[PDB]
Design a protein around this ligand. Structure first.
Ligand code: FMN
Length: 109
């Protein structure tokens, strides 16, 4: 929907760590930059997170392809929320993946 957050991951590093996150991302998740920059976004996952959906994202990434999934995530305070995540690979002219961009939408309603 209209309200959403955005983040950028560096695919030139093995674990796709975050290099940038929108104002909304920090405010929604409750985390600060000096807390999540340089880290993979998997810290948003938790107990009820469907490993099957997580695997789908992992596969798309390893294949350097776009993907959209609905996942249960948790704020820094531990409270849950439903996240409709869409990941998009950004490539250089040589065809290789340089960055991955992510758009998150809280669809908890
Ligand atoms: C740009 C980008 C944004 C992501 N955003 C989220 C997110 O908001 N929530 C989430 O649970 N996983 C998110 N992921 C997925 C995890 O970072 C990680 O790719 C996934 O869990 C891969 O599987 P693994 O944790 O088993 O290695 C994102 C990945 C990328 C590349």
């Amino acid at each position: 929907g209209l309200r959403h957050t955005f983040v950028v991951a560096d695919a030139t590093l093995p674990d796709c760590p975050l290099v940038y996150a929108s104002e909304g991302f920090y405010a929604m998740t409750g985390y600060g930059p000096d807390e999540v920059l340089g880290h993979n976004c998997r810290f948003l996952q938790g107990e009820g997170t469907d490993p099957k959906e997580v695997q789908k994202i992992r596969d798309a990434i390893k294949k350097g392809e776009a993907c959209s999934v609905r996942l249960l995530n948790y704020r820094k305070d531990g409270t849950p929320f439903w996240n409709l995540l869409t990941v998009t690979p950004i490539k250089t002219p040589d065809g290789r993946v340089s960055k991955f961009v992510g758009v998150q939408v809280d669809v908890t309603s």
